[PDB]
Design a protein around this ligand. Structure first.
Ligand SMILES: O=c1[nH]cnc2c(C[N@@H+]3C[C@H](CO)[C@@H](O)C3)c[nH]c12
Ligand SMILES: O=c1[nH]cnc2c(C[N@@H+]3C[C@H](CO)[C@@H](O)C3)c[nH]c12
Ligand SMILES: O=c1[nH]cnc2c(C[N@@H+]3C[C@H](CO)[C@@H](O)C3)c[nH]c12
Lengths: 282, 282, 282
């Protein structure tokens, strides 16, 4: 890890002295979900590039910002554009923001992402509440906590079996019902793979045999660091496509499929996340 | 990645100006299949060591060469000796040649390798056409595309579900039949593991449960880069041994088993690859 | 790999000239099993910090020592405190001691560790003889042998299917019986995951579906290097906890659970290992 405790501290103190805002809930916007930032009030924007120690977004669009504000009753800080392992960033950079949030006083992390549906029940547009995850990169050594542990952040061996807050998942299922929606709220296991290339049929079948319901290339690292910090964690995936699981299919996954899904059924998540804020204690 | 676009360009321009040859088909010879280079005509040899930017073959035998020539009607470039992740090379070095080939004007990549048979139907000597692959290293982050993407080569998120050209596999199955051969042409999924040590019984069973038919320590990376480049890709494995899958067996996999298999039934692949050239469009 | 052959040689020659002891059996003590060092006679202690080229134990307790002595009839060298991948050490550092032992004249390696039970038959306190292992990190590239091979240590492609000495496992099962013990001696497959965070329910189920009986974050690397060296290898795990495999459970794995188990049923292993020494040929 190239960061020392001081680095996280310095970045937090810089932010704290450049904004009157004091966030309680940190929200990471997945692909095509950045619009969520438009629902904040008294919003204050910070480009990642201007924040000390922040990984500088190479060239995925040069759009990487931290937005502080209020979202339906809660002091929030949103990440519009997140870092991925496939871009070349080691995991201690990918998750650097999470530890900054903790030092800012955030006690809750809401993570969202786009994902390929592995579970056949799922349909494009569906929203999957994340009940658990399979950290494939983690089994091999790509775990954000690798390296000496800093007691100031947490324990050497944190548990992850209870990573996704049970209470929030219940209130999430409730809220979705209280809203009376067409499709039911899906729930399941998210498996992380490094990417950036999409899965083959044989790989899709592997992921399915392991019991995964959705596949993506992010999230798990941030969740692990959040939990290590003691933050409450809740999240979901927007199923943007059904992964090809048989050789008969003549279609293939693409960047267009994802953002298009994250174009129409996108707003649904935005509302959901906004309303869900009221369900977050304080 | 330690290479810049210029590096691939410079290596290609160096090669293009040192040979009259202009290859269309790049062929990577697997272990004990290097003999294929003997069937080329008007052959021109280049030691890897003399080619700018090429990874210098440490000491597996100091024999690493790029051979340009004509193989049964096609302008080819063959790699005699390929780079493996287990030797210490990062994947952007292992696959460096593939991107060079693309800039040389190659539009087809034929990959061959030796592999342990996981599917019980398989027998030593069998030839398995590769229909799909499981990129285990890739799930964890060891994917040749990790790092910033260069649009000049391809997209950020390329698909791999259609990596192994359907047309070529059909024509391959045809050709094998048109030849009238003793054993049938096997077909299946190739799973890549980093190695260099051989699998344990428990690991063999894992690989089998995942749906893999053959196991090796190469190929997948080159295939991914080829596909990312837009090259047509076809390949197969020479089953050099049956991986031990039960504790009763008193035998063990060894370097001798592999090359010996790649000694007798080796020539069969050579002929097949040569004849298959006519089936490659232009 | 940052070590050259000379480095292993220099460390061995330093040790050989600082102790009259000439070990035959190297023993790696797992978590909460370090007490085994108390049963040695004519013990001579070396702090890791004073041994040339040894990885310097960061801050897990600053307690890292190499103890030479006699254990029930055998010249031993014990590692009290072992290196883990999750601490940040690359595998060539984690396994550095193993190659030193080989040069010291050791021909047998006994590895012990604490592990979570995946097999439902297992109960906290149980002892599992290791019959095989699943090297998950290894599939991805994290294999201690990655990099150029040194013939002086072993072959480029060593087999691992017979890693855990059949004879010793039999004599181990015998010894345990000759002692007449309450619980039966468990036997099974050990799966290594990098850690340091504990497994989620979904991950536990993955590990179970793969056929693993116990899960830990060490051992496999040392075993692979030992085998590559030609050493005889035997080992076992102390089941310190039952990994959560269903969402109904309201408990979670923790550092306290492990050491507590490695507190009571710990001595049982110590005796077993001591007695087992007589079963090790010479
Ligand atoms: O089929 C899939 N496989 C793996 N990841 C995704 C995702 C998730 N994100 C979306 C984004 C690519 O379009 C990249 O960062 C991965 C959507 N569909 C799939
Ligand atoms: O049983 C096996 N397991 C994994 N790879 C191979 C291979 C393939 N190549 C062959 C070569 C070793 O002999 C090394 O580079 C791996 C043949 N048999 C097996
Ligand atoms: O449930 C488990 N999962 C993974 N490893 C272990 C271990 C083994 N060691 C023990 C130690 C943590 O308490 C760390 O180095 C891992 C015991 N229980 C479990």
């Amino acid at each position: 890890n190239g960061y020392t405790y001081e680095d996280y501290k310095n970045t937090a103190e810089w932010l704290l002295s450049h904004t009157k805002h004091r966030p309680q809930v940190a929200i990471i916007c997945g692909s095509g979900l950045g619009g969520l930032t438009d629902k904040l009030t008294q919003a204050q924007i910070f480009d990642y590039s201007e924040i000390p120690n922040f990984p500088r977004s190479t060239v995925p669009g040069h759009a990487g910002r931290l937005v502080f504000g209020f979202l339906n009753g809660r002091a929030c800080v949103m990440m519009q554009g997140r870092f991925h392992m496939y871009e070349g960033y080691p995991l201690w950079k990918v998750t650097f923001p999470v530890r900054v949030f903790h030092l800012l006083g955030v006690d809750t992390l809401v993570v969202t992402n786009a994902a390929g549906g592995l579970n056949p029940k799922f349909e494009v547009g569906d929203i999957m509440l994340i009940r658990d995850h399979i950290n494939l990169p983690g089994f091999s050594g790509q775990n954000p906590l690798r390296g000496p542990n800093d007691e100031r952040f947490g324990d050497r061996f944190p548990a992850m079996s209870d990573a996704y807050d049970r209470t929030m998942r219940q209130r999430a299922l409730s809220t979705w019902k209280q809203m009376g929606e067409q499709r039911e709220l899906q729930e399941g296991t998210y498996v992380m793979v490094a990417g950036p290339s999409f899965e083959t049929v044989a790989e899709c079948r592997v992921l399915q045999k392991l019991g995964a319901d959705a596949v993506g290339m992010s999230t798990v690292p941030e969740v692990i660091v959040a939990r290590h910090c003691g933050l409450r964690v809740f999240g979901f995936s927007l199923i943007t496509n059904k992964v090809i699981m048989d050789y008969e299919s003549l279609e293939k996954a693409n960047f267009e499929e994802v953002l298009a899904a994250g174009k129409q059924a996108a707003q649904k998540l935005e509302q959901f996340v906004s309303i869900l804020m009221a369900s977050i204690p304080l």
